[PDB]
Amino acid sequence: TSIAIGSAEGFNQADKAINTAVKSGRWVMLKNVHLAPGWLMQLEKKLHSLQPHACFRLFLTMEINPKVPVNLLRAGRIFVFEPPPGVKANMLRTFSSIPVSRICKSPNERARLYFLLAWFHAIIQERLRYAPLGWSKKYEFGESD
Amino acid sequence: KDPLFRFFEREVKMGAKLLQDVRQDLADVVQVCEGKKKQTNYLRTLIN
Amino acid sequence: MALEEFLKQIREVWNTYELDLVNYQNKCRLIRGWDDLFNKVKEHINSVSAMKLSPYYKVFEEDALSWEDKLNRIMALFDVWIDVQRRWVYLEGIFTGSADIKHLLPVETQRFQSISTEFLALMKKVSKSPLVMDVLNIQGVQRSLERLADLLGKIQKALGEYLERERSSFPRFYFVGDEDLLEIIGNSKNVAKLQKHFKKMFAGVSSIILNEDNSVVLGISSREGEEVMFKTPVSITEHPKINEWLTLVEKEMRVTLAKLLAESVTEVEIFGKATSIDPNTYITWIDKYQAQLVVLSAQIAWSENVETALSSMGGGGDAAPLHSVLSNVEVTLNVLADSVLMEQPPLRRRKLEHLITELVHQRDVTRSLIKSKIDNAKSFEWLSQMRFYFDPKQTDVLQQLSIQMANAKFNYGFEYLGVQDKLVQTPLTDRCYLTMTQALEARLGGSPFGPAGTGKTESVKALGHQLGRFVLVFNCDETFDFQAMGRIFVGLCQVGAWGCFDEFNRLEERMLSAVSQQVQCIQEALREHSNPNYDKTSAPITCELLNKQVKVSPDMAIFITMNPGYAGRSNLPDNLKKLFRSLAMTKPDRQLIAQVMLYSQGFRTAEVLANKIVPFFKLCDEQLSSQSHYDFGLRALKSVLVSAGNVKRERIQKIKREKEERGEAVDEGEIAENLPEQEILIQSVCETMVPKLVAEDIPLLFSLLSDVFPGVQYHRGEMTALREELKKVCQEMYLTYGDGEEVGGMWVEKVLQLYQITQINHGLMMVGPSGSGKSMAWRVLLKALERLEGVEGVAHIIDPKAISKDHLYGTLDPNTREWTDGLFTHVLRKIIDSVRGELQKRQWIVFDGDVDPEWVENLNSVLDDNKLLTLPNGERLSLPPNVRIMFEVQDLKYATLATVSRCGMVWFSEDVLSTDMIFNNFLARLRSIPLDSPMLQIQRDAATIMQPYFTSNGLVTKALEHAFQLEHIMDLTRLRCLGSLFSMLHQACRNVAQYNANHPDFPMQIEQLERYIQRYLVYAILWSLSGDSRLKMRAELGEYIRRITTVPLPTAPNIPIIDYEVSISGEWSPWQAKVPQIEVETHKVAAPDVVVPTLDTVRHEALLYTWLAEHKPLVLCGPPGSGKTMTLFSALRALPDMEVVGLNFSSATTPELLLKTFDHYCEYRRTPNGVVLAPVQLGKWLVLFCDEINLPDMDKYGTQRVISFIRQMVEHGGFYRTSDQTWVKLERIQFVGACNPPTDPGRKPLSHRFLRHVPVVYVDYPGPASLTQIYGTFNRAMLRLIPSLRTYAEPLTAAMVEFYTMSQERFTQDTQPHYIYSPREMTRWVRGIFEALRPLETLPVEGLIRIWAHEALRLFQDRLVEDEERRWTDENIDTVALKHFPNIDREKAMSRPILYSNWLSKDYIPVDQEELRDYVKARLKVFYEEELDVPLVLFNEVLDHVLRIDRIFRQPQGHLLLIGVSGAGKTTLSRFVAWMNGLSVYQIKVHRKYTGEDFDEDLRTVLRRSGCKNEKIAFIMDESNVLDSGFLERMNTLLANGEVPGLFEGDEYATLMTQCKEGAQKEGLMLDSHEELYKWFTSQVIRNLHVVFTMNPSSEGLKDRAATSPALFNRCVLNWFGDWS
Amino acid sequence: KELKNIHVCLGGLFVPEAYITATRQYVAQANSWSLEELCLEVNVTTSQGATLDACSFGVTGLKLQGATCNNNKLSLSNAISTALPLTQLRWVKQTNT
């Protein structure tokens, strides 16, 4: 159950989803939680005094923001998502994301096209690390492209 | 009729205006450091 | 005797006047002909007023007064009877036609049944007697109509659920507002009333075509007039329900558009693949079918021809039939182009322009294909272009046509679009089409971003119209919350329409994140729907929106256009950006747009014109001086090209009229070839861009035009009729008018430019510094247009930033989702409704005030080609063609380019309003308007006397020119000085009139008047041009005037002129003649209302009396404690007709403070001319004194809401009542301001528009001589209690002045925020010494010095922070006392433990430390056993602190501000001392749920106890209790005044009044009125309530508190406890 | 004539693009042509060995990023920036070549 934070109805839906999932064991994801730091503090205080199901998981996807409460950061486990370090890592991540069944399709030339496209994406994204020369401005060349 | 002078007068005008503003502001800062004048809101911010 | 004749005529008219009645379904007889009665009453009122103007009005004054009375009663009755009738009609249409509302909502159905019974009884009673008066004189008729309106409006707001179900039934209802939806539902039977509601429901359907019976829908029509005739007409008799036959109309429109498109394609295939085309047949085909249909037919024909030609070349080595297609396209283009150069009807002209643009696109595409050597239809160079494929074989007519681009496939929606303006298919537009179609194929959204003016919204609209979709533009802003967007998305899903949410990023970022859910769910639903396995049999994909399952139509889409990097914008969350395919729109192809536009308008040299006009715009944008209001984007070019087309058309019409007038010789080709297109383009450019130019950019742009367009000149036409109207209007308004180079040529030229821009644009901006004639320019233009064209011109002046944006546009309740109209929205909706014929009048909505992106950006869709005002509840208001949006601003520093590019700019420099025009206006107004006939004669004579000086290069102008060279406390504006001078001269005229009145036997001669007027003019110039500067600048201005002037001046060598007044005898008399050495009474020494008269005191009192006598608002600016309030109250005492009311502005002051004061002290009354706000007392002038007018916060956009509110209430003479958006005009109210200099911290300089109206006088600190005189007078008065000490008054006051001067010098505001010293310290010093000396009968010199030193310590050492400062204070007190009092025994008088207490004796005598300590120990034991069992350890500082607190608790209105580290015992010591002094300690109990209402309740309780029960209370309050700024605001008001005006209201106010009456009876006073009782309550609260404020010694916290609540540092004695030493 | 003759560092000017526009329109007025018929002819030479004709203008301080200009021809270089000695820009008729 994925809920985007930012509205009061969003808070109510998130609370209901968490209260149902701690018993049913389902997963709950909340997006852009960095916009409501006080509700983050309340949610962390709620989480500390709780006994969840074995399979329950809570994902709090946020933007790197100093306004996020420190206690929530200490309570949870932090994953940082950011540009891959290099061309090789970028291609590795691109190939990992794409399902194997999709590349290995009936035309045998699809795989080479995918490799070329992944190399192009890696070059485009790695050039972005060089703001004045590689490009003219920090474009949003991302996974959607 | 000369576009050169049309642009050129604008250059000299802005240069003189901004030069006068900067010199007056810096003289005010110097006078504040010497204590001969009080600090105003704009002058206090500029000091900041 | 024509008065009696006209009155008899009107009597006969009204007696014969009968009320027209028409039936309604055999139920009742409605009133008809509202406009006739309305303008009959209006012209009768005008006639009666004109009679009142006549001198013979006296004999028929009573009769005309009674006639006005009954006419106003008719107005009052019929201004609400029409509303009641209409609302009953479209409520009965709901409560009778629909049967579901009975079971759904029965209770207000029964209520409406009763109301309808009452209304029909009233209507039948009216029908019995159709006479107007017999209807009018009915008892209780007005109250009955008002109650009916109240009840019907109550019912109308209680129909939301039924409206939601109706919107569910028919999807297109979602875009229809509350009132409009009830109107549609009620008037289903009366379809003639629904014609004005179709425009907001369909794309271009503005009205439907009905038969004679109004029972069969024959077809539809657009705003232009183009008609679509249904193949199978739909009969509403078979389908009575509104939604059913509306859906049938929609479906029949789709079907008939499909069939007509099929026929049109079949017909146009002949024109295609044809070597030659007959112009007559092609014109017939164009005329036969609609614009969108002919464009679609041309597109289909060209696409099929190109596909067929490409298929031929499949082998590669075949011929090139694409050349045949290109030749065919070129031939057709030539045919249409030759058709354009001759005249056509407007509809056919628009069709030709659309087809020419489309065929230019087709020719360019075909040329590109031929160049690219494309031979295969499957090549991407052909697939990327937008292709149309027609299937006449398809059984379903709607799927006959398929539109494809790349791999995307769409079906034409067949929604009638009307005649829309197509866009030139530039390469950027093609890129947009490709990207957006690719996004739609992936079931994503489109996000074309970029700087404003790049054709983002228009490109999306053009693409949506290309596919035949319903495109909606929503001007998004920060009140588009989650629920409103959910409702909008539900409407889009159910209708099947595109949503263009322009300015998407303006939303709150959290709201964007929330809306991401709805966007993602809709996109997933569409993605599932697009799967081919889904079939018609299964239910359509239902998405979950707002916890509701909503059917999602395939055709829907979501487009958002955002403008990055501007103000008032958010950043989109990444989970939202990934749902939209963004596209960059930065550089539109301006040259191609210009070329195609000019080619379609009929310009033969379009290529050269574009190649000369497009680099010209870059030349202007790069060479002209950079300014905030300059714009040279695509919108400016579009305006120029449209203006050029219009100018060409009017020139052709002029040539035709000339040729038909002079003989008969007309040839279209001869006119076309002989036509100066260069000149037309130059004229359009000058008419569009010259107004916005600054004075030094006009010749630059003219030379640029000469460089790019040599040989052509601009000869602006002379609007002789308009100039005559302007001359007449300027005559009637005492304005200076001049043609060309005369005085006033530039202003009238600007007025003509404004007229031209109003003619072109629907949005204007009169930009220019305050004092440039913008207001007068547009007022004169409006009146001239009214008097010229014969159409009545009205204006609604709205101040945008004087009220909150929620009050300006409206708001939505998050709980009930009910819409309340704002100020601007109400005005626009009322104009659109045209309930009283507002569409026939010229309506101008003028936004006089500051502009920032927060409020103006919601007008983006209004100023666009859309001309829509989009509301959060989904409603859109179409701008009427006669409405103009005007902005009257001084600067556009803070407005974004999106606003700048939308408004025609007219720049008013300060050179436009020459000082000579102001002088002439003043002289004419003086000669015409009486000031109170003797008044007129004296006033004209004075004007004649002042004429030589009020001239160019005269004394006044030269002095004003020298004035700006001086240093003023506030920035010097020309109109401020001029208005001050004019007011003072009017006061001089009134002084002459009073002198004549006091001397009936001997009126003033000419020589006295001449000398008096000359001397007073010099005096007024001196006190107006330098009244707001120091003494040195006043002296310098006096010296300059003495050098330049020629009138007599005082002969004194060293005495400055400003020291002299102008006596009524016409001679200079020094002000010192009015400064007596008065001897103050001993019991009145240093009393609050006692003023020692000195030079500055009398001068400023005279100046304030002069300004307030005119009811002219004024501001006294000076350092704190200088004497501004004292001077004002001293001057106001000479005006017994003016009652002053106290206001205390702070950092968080809002106009709600002024509104509460108005409610408390004034009352709103309904008058024939409108709502007038006047004081409750009759004949008294309320004076609102704002003590800290310049503290209110300036926003990030440089504005103060309360300052704008005051400026609106001063300049326009009133404000707007946001309860019902009714203009309220102030009566008998003026404003007086006081403020520290803006250079002081926390002080914000006032806007130049506000300073224009208010003179400023600078009240500086009294000098050492003035201080010596004043406090020597007090000391001599005080020292009469002790005859033996009478010789020490002079050294005592000398020592006090010396110590105060060194204390001011040593400690400044730089070190600490509270280090302020003023004569207030001397006043408290004298008060303390007098109170100490009052009970004692004898006392030696040493005792007096000891009291003096004790008060010096308690004043100058209490507030200090550092220990070194206190050591310096001690040493300086010692040295000063030794210097001024030699030969006294220092030890007895200056032992270091200087302590005074009245605890060990009945008298305030010095007390030794040990006995005081023992007494404090005993009292502490008693306190422990009684109140608080918290043991305390005594030390010297505790004794000092308790002595200080006891001192404060014994003074009236004595509040405390204790500053020190927490846990130092501040609260405990305060409670202990209050327990000694009998004060009942009150503390507010703060919890996490403590809010503003709880604080208000606590304040109410403490004020009730301390004002009605006469119970002394020590209100102890801590900074931890301050949870909101409202706490501090209420505390500030209570501390400064002793009463909170808005605290008591309604039930609580009546209860307080009863309690105050009981308390006054208990004290034995006889008061019964509410005003006197409230004054007594305020006095008791002042005398009884004490507030002790405790706070931590924060550095920045103290500075913030010094601005958010100035009262703590003025009314509260500040003690710095600090940490324990 | 002196205004046209002197060499101007484009970096020091507040709006160098307006300077370029001014010289463009000056030369256009000299040749009485239209702007879109005018292109750029840029010659990079040493200040000492420089001759300015009726259509030439002196520009100093232009920095070349990642290339070197020798005899009006560019060579890719590993140097970050290469200061152009003196930039002479001319306005001539378009040849649409």
Ligand SMILES: Nc1ncnc2c1ncn2[C@@H]1O[C@H](COP(=O)(O)OP(=O)(O)OP(=O)(O)O)[C@@H](O)[C@H]1O
């Ligand atoms: N044509 C005129 N001839 C003479 N006096 C004029 C004329 N037009 C305006 N004035 C006077 O000049 C002053 C300017 O008034 P106005 O309100 O038009 O100025 P403004 O520039 O629009 O000011 P603001 O920025 O406060 O709106 C007024 O005193 C007005 O009476």
Ligand SMILES: Nc1ncnc2c1ncn2[C@@H]1O[C@H](COP(=O)(O)OP(=O)(O)O)[C@@H](O)[C@H]1O
């Ligand atoms: N391709 C085009 N052909 C003709 N006119 C255009 C074209 N694109 C844009 N325009 C004009 O430019 C203006 C663009 O306004 P708009 O699209 O609202 O700007 P934005 O969307 O960037 O705020 C419109 O008035 C339109 O008439």
Ligand SMILES: Nc1ncnc2c1ncn2[C@@H]1O[C@H](COP(=O)(O)OP(=O)(O)O)[C@@H](O)[C@H]1O
């Ligand atoms: N001529 C004077 N005679 C007597 N008192 C004066 C005179 N001038 C100034 N004062 C004292 O100065 C104080 C001015 O206070 P106030 O008018 O409230 O200043 P502000 O309005 O600037 O806060 C008064 O308390 C008054 O006693």
Ligand SMILES: Nc1ncnc2c1ncn2[C@@H]1O[C@H](COP(=O)(O)OP(=O)(O)O)[C@@H](O)[C@H]1O
């Ligand atoms: N002179 C003193 N001797 C002993 N204890 C003291 C003294 N002054 C204050 N205290 C202690 O301070 C406490 C009260 O602090 P309080 O006055 O509420 O702090 P604040 O002044 O910040 O409100 C009491 O419990 C008392 O024990």
Ligand SMILES: [Mg+2]
């Ligand atoms: Mg737009």
Ligand SMILES: [Mg+2]
């Ligand atoms: Mg004005």
